[PDB]
C-alpha cells in the first residue's frame, strides 16, 4: 500500500531502524498536502454521479460501437450501460481513496493489479477508461494543488492502461 | 500495513462506498493534530536507548531471578537477546504511533510472539513487565512540558498507552 | 546516505516504478524543512570554535581522569586534548551535514559505521562522546524547528554511542 | 547515489570542512525553487506512457530497418524489449530531476550500457535517437504555461535536457 | 505421477509380478483408441479461453455477491485470481486426459485446495459451480461431430466428466 | 523453444543422460506427423497472398470503426492498412513455421513472447487479431492433420490473445 | 518417472502451460511404439522361466568362481543360486515394464536408483549381471521393432552397471 | 539450440520469408531417412560404456605418460574427470545426430571446452585423439549390417562423423 | 551437542557454581581411561561395513517380508535408504561413544526419527532388530583381546551397549 | 561450541563421515591437556575469593572513579561493588569451565557472545575488566602447562575486550 | 584435505578466528602421534617390495580366475600382473602418506575420491583389492601405535571398498 | 593449503614416491621442536590486539596523511577496515606458522591482495610498514625469555619472520 506514512514505515522498518528526521519530514509533507487532497475528495464525491455519467457518455460518443455491437463485452443495452457505470464508478472512487490517502496505494492494490488479466479476458478495451479518465480530467472543475494531485492520480490511471 | 488513512479506505471499499463527509472530518481532524503525534514519535525515539536500559535495569532490580544463574536473561547472549526484544518492542510502538494504526505492530510484531517465547522458554510475564515499564517512561517522555509548546496531549498519551498495552497482553 | 530525497528515489526504483504523488510529498516535506536545517548548519558552523572547546571542557570536567591518565587514549597531553577536540569537531561537523541534507545519511556513513570497533580498539568510552554531544545540545542556542531537528541529530549520535 | 544535498556533503567531507556560505545559499536557492521542480517531475511522469510510445513511433518511421525482419526491434520480444529500454531511461531521467543529480542515473541505468548493447548487436546510437526524442517531448511538456502559476524554468529546463543528454552520450 | 501405462506397471511391482494377458490387452485397448483421447485434449485446449471466460461469466451474473464489492472476486487482483484458478483447473484436468490416469489432477491440483480456500474464505461451493460449468462446456467441445471423423467417444466422455467430477467434489 | 526434437533433447540433457527409447518414440511422432505438417506448409504458404488479405478485410468488416478513427493505431490511411496487412502476415507466417517445426516453438519466440506489452503500448486490441486468426482457419482450405495441426496453431495464438 | 506421458504433462506442467501439438506428437510415438512394445512384453513374458534360469546357468558357466567360493554373495549353495535367479528375474521384470511404459522410468526407480551402492556393500559384481543381460539378449528371440525396444532396455541396464 | 527444422525456421525469419518449396522439400528428404537416423542414435547410445572404455584404455596404452603419476590423468580423481570427459562429448555429439544440427553440440559442450583444458594443464591434443578413437568405433557401429534393415546410411555417416570432427578441432 | 565436559559444564552453570569435586573426578576417570574409548571409537569404525552388512542380511533373512515385493526393503533404492540407515545410526553411536555423552546421538539422529517411520511406512521394530545385530556384533569387536594391550573394558562395554538401546528404544 | 570433542565430532558429521585417526588424535591432543587443565580448574576454584576481591581491588585501584561516581553503572555503593565482584567472578568461573572443556567455548557461548552490547548498553568500561584478567594472570599462582592454558583464556577474554 | 592440522587451520578459518587452545590441543596429538606414525611409514617403505607382490599373490591365490581369464581386465599376462601390482603398491604408497600426514587426507584426495568410477568402468573387483589389504595388515610387522595407526588405514581403505 | 606433512606428501605423489629416510628423519625433527611452534602461536595470538592496535597508532602516527579527511583511513568504516585488514594479515600468519606452511598465507590472504588495494586507491605500501611494525612486535613476544623453558627458538623465529615478509612484498 503506497502512502507517505505507509511506505516511510516500511523503509525504516526494511533497514531495522527507528523513524528519524527523514521519516518525520514525510509525515509534514503528508499531512500539509492532506487539507489540499482531503478537499478534493470532497469535490469529486459531490460530483461523483455527474461525473460518471458524464465520462461514460463520452465513452459512447468516441466509440459508438459500444451502445450498438451487440456482444457482453459491450453497452448496447441496459445490462453493459450498468456494467460501464460502475466500472467508471470504480475509478473515481479509487481516485478518491488516493488523495484520502495521498498516495497510488488504494487503486494499485484494488483496481490497477490484474486490471490486464480482466481487460484480456474479458474483451473490454483499455482505451474506453482512457477516455473516461480524460473526461473527469477535464470536468472535474478542480484547481489549485487539489486538481494537480487528483489529475497525477488520473494520469497514473490512463499510464497504467497504456 | 494500514496508517489511519488507508484503514478508513479499506473499510469503505469493502463496503464499495465513498468516504462520507463525517469520515473524512474525522481524518481531517487527525491531521490537524499531527504535530503533537511526531513530537512523541521524536522524543520517544530520541530517548529509546535511555527508556530501554532504565526499564530494563529496573525490571532485572524488580525480579533477580531473570539475571541469577539459569535465569533467562543470565548469559551474555541472553541479556543482549533480551535488550534486544525491548528495543524491538518499543521500535514497533512508535511505528504505530506514527502510522496512527496498531496494524504495523500487530503483524510484524507481537503476531506469534507469545508463541515465540513459549518455545524458548522465555517467561512472557516478564517481558510483559518490562514492556509496561517503558510504556511508563515513554509516556512521561511525551507528556513533559519542557522545551515544547504548551497544549493537550491527553488523547494521543491514551493512543500511546494502548499500543503498549497491545505488547504486554500480546505476550502474557 | 539516508535523506528524504534519495530514499524516495530508492523506493521508486526498488519498485521499478515512476515518481508518484507518495514521493512528491516526500520532496514538499524535506524542503519546507530545509529552512530550519540550513539555518541551523550555519549558526552551529559560525559558533563552531566555542561548541567544540567548550564541549571538550563539558567531558573532561565529567570524567577527570580522562586528563590524569598516561594512556594515548587519554588526553591529559596536548595530544590527546587535540585528537579530542578533532573527534568533536567531527561530530559537529556531521551532524551539519546531516541537517544540510535532512537526514542522518552522512553520518550514518563517514562516522557511525565502525565507530564502535575504534572506540573499542583505541579504549575510547562512548560515554565521553555521548556528555560532548549534551553540551552541543544545551548550548547550540536554536531555537523551534531548528533547535529540534538539530537535536534529534545529536540525539541520534548518542542512540548509536548507547 | 547523491542528491543535490548530499553530493555537496560530499565533496566538503574529503576537505574535511563545513560547507560555505556560499554553498548553502546556493542549496537554498534550489530550495526555493523547488515547486517548479516537482511540477516537472509530476507533469513528466504523468505523460510517461505518451512520451515513450511517441518517441518509439517516431523512431520507428525514421528508421524502418529496426522493425523489418532481422531488424534488432523486430519479433515481439525485442520490441518489448527496446520499449521497455525508453521506459527505463526515461524513469531514471525523472528520478535525476526530483534528486537535482545525475548520479542515480549514471550509476544505475547508463553505467556499462554501451557494452550491453554491444554485447547484444543492439544498435546503441538508435536508443540516442530516440531518447532524444523524448527529450524534445518532455521539454515542452515541462514547458506547457496553461495550467500553472507562470514563471520562469530556464534554469530547470537546462537541467533536464543535460540528463537527457547524459543518456545519449552514454549509448552514443 | 502415473500415466495409464506406468499406473499397471506400479501396481504390479508392488506384488513383483509380470502384467497379465488381460491387463496388457486392457492397455491395447486404449492404446487403440488414443486418437480420440489425444482429440478430445487439442479440443478443449483449443477452447479453453472460450470455456474459461463464459464459465465465469456465467458463474457471475448467477451469483452476484461475488462481484459485489466485499465479494471475494471483488478487486480487480480477486477476479484475476479467480479466473485464474478456473484456468488452472481446466488445465489439470486436460492432463488427466492426456495420460489417462488422474493422479496429476488430485497430486498437483486438488490436494489440499479444499484447505486453501476454506483459509482464504473463497466459497468451494461457488468454484464448484464454477466448474460444472466449463465441464458442461468441455464435454459438448468433445462431442462436437463437425470437422471430425465420426465415432464413439461415450467411454472417454466419462472419463473426462470424472475428472471435473473430482474437481467439484475436491472444493465442495 | 518448443519443438518435439529440441524438448527431447533439452529434457535428457538437463537430466544429464543419453536420448533413450522415450526421446526415440518423441521422434517417431514428429518425423510421422511432419509429413502432413510440411504439407500445409506449403498449402498455405501458396495461398498467403489472399489469406492475408481476406482475414484483413474480415477484420475491417468485424470492426468498421478501425478503418474510420484517425489515430495511429488504426488503418484510416495506407500506412495503418499495411500495418495491419503486415501483422496478420506475421501470424500466418509463424503458423507455417509452426507447422515446419512440429510446434509452437517458432511462434513463441518470434512473436508470442512480448505481445502483450506491444498491444497495450500501441493499443492495438487483441480482439481485431482474433477475427484475423478465426478468417484463416475458415479459409486456409486445409484438411486432416493438416488442418488440425494448423488450427491447433491459429487456435494458440487465439488464447494467448483472449 | 521416465516415459512419454508422463514426461510431455511435466514438462508442460513446469511450464506452467497447456499441452500443444508437441505433447500430442510424443504421444503419437508412445501409442504408435506401444503396438511393438505391448506385444514384445508378452512374449519376454511368456519366455520367462527360460530366459531367467538359462540367464543364470549361463553367468554360472563364464565365472565358474561363483558356485564355489563359500562367500554369501556367491552362489555355492542353493540360498546364493535361488538369490541370484531371482535378481536376474527382477531385471527381465523391469524389461517387460519398460516396454510397457515406453521407457526406462520403472527400471530406473525400482532397479537403477541404488543398484551401485548394494552391489558394493553386498560385493555382488556388476560383470555377473552383464553376461546374464547378454544372455537376455541373444535368448529372447524377438524381432523387428520388439527387439530393437527390448534390446535398448537391455543394453541400458548394461550400461548402467559398466 | 536448434534442430533441423528450427535450423531452417530462423534463418527464414531474419529474411522474414516463409520456406521455399525447395526448403520444405530438403527437409522432406530427411523425415524420410529419419528410421536410419534414429537407428544411428540407440546404436551409440547403446554401446556408449564400450566405446569410452575402449577409447580411453586405448589412449592411455598409447600415451602413458597421460596415467605416469604426475600425469593429467593420474590419481582416482582425475582418471573418473577425464572418462567422464570422454562421455560427455559422446553425449552431446548423439545429442547433435538425433536433432540433425550441430548447434546443441557447439553450444553446450564444446564452446570454450578449450579454454577451460588450457587453464587446467589438461592435454587438449589427447583428448582430441581419445575423440577420434571413439569415432570410428562410434562409426563401425552404426555402420553394422547385423541385425538391421539393409539399406544406405552413408551420408547419415559422413553427417555423424562431421560432429566428432567439430569436438576434435573445438579441443586441439 | 555436548561432550562429557561440556555436559557437566552447561549442568553447572545452569547453577552458577564451579564445578563440584564428585565432578571433576568423574571427569578425571574418563581422561586416565580414554585410551580404551578411542580403541573402542576405532574398533567398530575399522569394522562399520561388516557390522552394518551383516546385520541388514541377518535381518533380512529373520523377516524376509521386508525385501518380497511390495515389502519397505524392496527395490533397489528403498534398500540403498535401508543400508544407509544402519550406516548413519552406527555413525551416530560412534560419535556419542567418542564424546563421553548420547546428546549428538539424541539430537541429530533419534529425534523425530519413530515419528519419520511413522509417516513412511517403515516398521521401526525391524530397525530396532537391525540395531540390536549391530550392538552385539560392535560389542564382540570392542571386546575382542587380540591386538591390543590387554586390560579391562567392562565399564565402555556397558557404555556403548547403552547409546545402541537409545537408539533400539527410539524407534521401537 | 568450541571444544577439542565437539569440533572433531562436528566436522566429521558435517562431512558426513565415520571418525578417524584424525580426530583420534584430536582426542589424545585433549585428553594429554585435561590432565594439566582439571587440575588447574580445581587450583583457581579453591583460590576463588581470594582471586576475585583481589582483582576487583585491582580495578579500583586502576580506575579510582568507579568508586566515586554515583551512576548505576559504577561502584560507589555496595550495590556497585557487588556487582563488579559478582561480573569478575563469571570471569573466572569460565576460566576454569574452558580449562575443564579444553576450550574456550564454554566462555564464548555463556559471557563473550553480546559482551558488547552489555557493556554499551550499561556504559560499563571493557578496560575495567581487562585490569581484572591482568591481576588473576599474574596471582593465579599456577605452573607448567596449567598456566598457559589458563592464560591463553585469560587473554582471549582480554583480546575480545579489545 | 583430512589431517590434524589442515583441519585445525580450516575449521577457525571457517569461524574467522585466530587459533586456539583446542587447535593447540589438535597439533599436540598430531605431534604426539607423528613419532610413531613417521617409523612406521620408514618401516613400510622398506619392505614394499615383499609386500607389494606378497599381496598379489595373495589375491591370485584367493582369486585364481583372475591369473586365467582373457579379459584386459584380469591379469593372466605379463601386462595384468604389472597392473595389478602397480595398483597394490598405490595403495601402500597412500597408506604411508596418511601415517606421514596423520590422517586419511592424502588417501581420500589421491585414490579414493572416483574410485568407485574406475573400477566400474574397467571391470576391477573391490574384492580383489580388500584381500591385498587384508595380506598388508598381517605382514607389515608393525608394533605398537604405528600398526594400530596403519591398520586404521587399511582398513578405512577396505571400507571404503565395501 | 597444506601443512608441513602434506606438503612434502603431495610432492611426492607427483613423483609417485614414497618420502625416502632423510626426508622422513627431517619431518621428525621438526616434530621434535613443536612445542616451540605452538608456544610461538601462543604467545602471537594472545597479545592479536595489543599488536594491531600499537602497530596501527604508530602507523597513523608516522603517515598522518593516511588519516587526515580524505586519506584513505578516514572515517570510520575505513578506519575500521584498515584494522580489520591488520588483523586479518596477522591472522593468517599465524595460522602458517602453526601448519608450517606458507600455503594458507599464500591461498587465502596475498594472492590477489595487491590488486585488491590498487583498485580501492589504498597505499600498499602505507600496508605494509603497518605489517613491517607487527612482525617486529610479534617476534619480540616470540622471543621474550620471562615464563617459559629456556631454549633456542631462532629457527623458528626465522620461519615465522619470513612469513611476515611474504605479506610485505605482496602489497608493496
Ligand atoms: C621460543 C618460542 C621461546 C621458547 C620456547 C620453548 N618452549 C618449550 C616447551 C614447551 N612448550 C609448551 C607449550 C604449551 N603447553 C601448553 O599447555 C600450551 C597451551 C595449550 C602450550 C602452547 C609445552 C607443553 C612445552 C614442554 C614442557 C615445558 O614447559 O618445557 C621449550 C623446551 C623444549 C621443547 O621443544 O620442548 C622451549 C625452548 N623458549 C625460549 O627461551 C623462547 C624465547
Redesign the interface.
Known amino acids: ?13 526494511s533497514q531495522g ?19 489540499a487532497g ?1 478537499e478534493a ?2 469535490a469529486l ?1 459531490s460530483k ?1 454521479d455527474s461525473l460518471i455519467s458524464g465520462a461514460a457518455q463520452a465513452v459512447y460518443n468516441k ?3 459500444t451502445t450498438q455491437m451487440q456482444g ?1 463485452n459491450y453497452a448496447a443495452d441496459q445490462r453493459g450501460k450498468d456494467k460501464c457505470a460502475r466500472d467508471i464508478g470504480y475509478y473515481l ?1 479509487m481516485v ?3 488523495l ?7 487503486m494499485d ?10 481487460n ?4 473490454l ?3 474506453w477508461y482512457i477516455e473516461a479518465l480524460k473526461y473527469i480530467k477535464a470536468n472535474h472543475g478542480l484547481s489549485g494543488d487539489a ?3 487528483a ?3 488520473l ?2 490511471a ?2 497504467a ?2 | 500495513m494500514f496508517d489511519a488513512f488507508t484503514k478508513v479506505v479499506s473499510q469503505a471499499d469493502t463496503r464499495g462506498e465513498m468516504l462520507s463527509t463525517a469520515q473524512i472530518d474525522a481524518l481531517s481532524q487527525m491531521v490537524a493534530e499531527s504535530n503533537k503525534r511526531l513530537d512523541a514519535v521524536n522524543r520517544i525515539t530520541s530517548n529509546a536507548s535511555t527508556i530501554v536500559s532504565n526499564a530494563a535495569r529496573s525490571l532485572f532490580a524488580e525480579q533477580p531471578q531473570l539475571i541469577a544463574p539459569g535465569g533467562n536473561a543470565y548469559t551474555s547472549r541472553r541479556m543482549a537477546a533480551c535488550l534486544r526484544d525491548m528495543e524491538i518492542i518499543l521500535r514497533y510502538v512508535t511505528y504505530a504511533v506514527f502510522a496512527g494504526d496498531a496494524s504495523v505492530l500487530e503483524d510484524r510484531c507481537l503476531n506469534g510472539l507469545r508463541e515465540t517465547y513459549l518455545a524458548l522458554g522465555t517467561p512472557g510475564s516478564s517481558v510483559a513487565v518490562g514492556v509496561g515499564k517503558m510504556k511508563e517512561a515513554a509516556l512521561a517522555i511525551v507528556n513533559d512540558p519542557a522545551g515544547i509548546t504548551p497544549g493537550d496531549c491527553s488523547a494521543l498519551a491514551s493512543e500511546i498507552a494502548s499500543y503498549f498495552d497491545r505488547a504486554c497482553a500480546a505476550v502474557s
Chains 1, 3, 6, 7, 10, 11 share one sequence.
Open positions: 500500500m503506497k502512502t507517505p506514512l505507509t511506505e516511510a514505515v516500511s523503509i525504516a522498518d531502524r527507528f523513524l528519524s528526521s527523514t521519516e518525520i519530514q514525510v509525515a509534514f509533507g503528508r499531512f500539509r498536502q492532506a487539507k482531503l475528495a470532497k464525491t461523483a466509440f459508438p460501437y457482453p472512487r478518491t481513496y488516493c484520502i490517502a495521498g498516495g497510488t496505494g488504494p492494490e484494488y483496481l490497477i493489479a490484474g486490471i490486464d488479466e480482466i484480456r479476458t474479458f474483451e478495451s483499455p482505451s486538481a494537480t494531485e489529475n497525477s492520480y494520469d497514473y490512463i499510464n492502461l497504456s
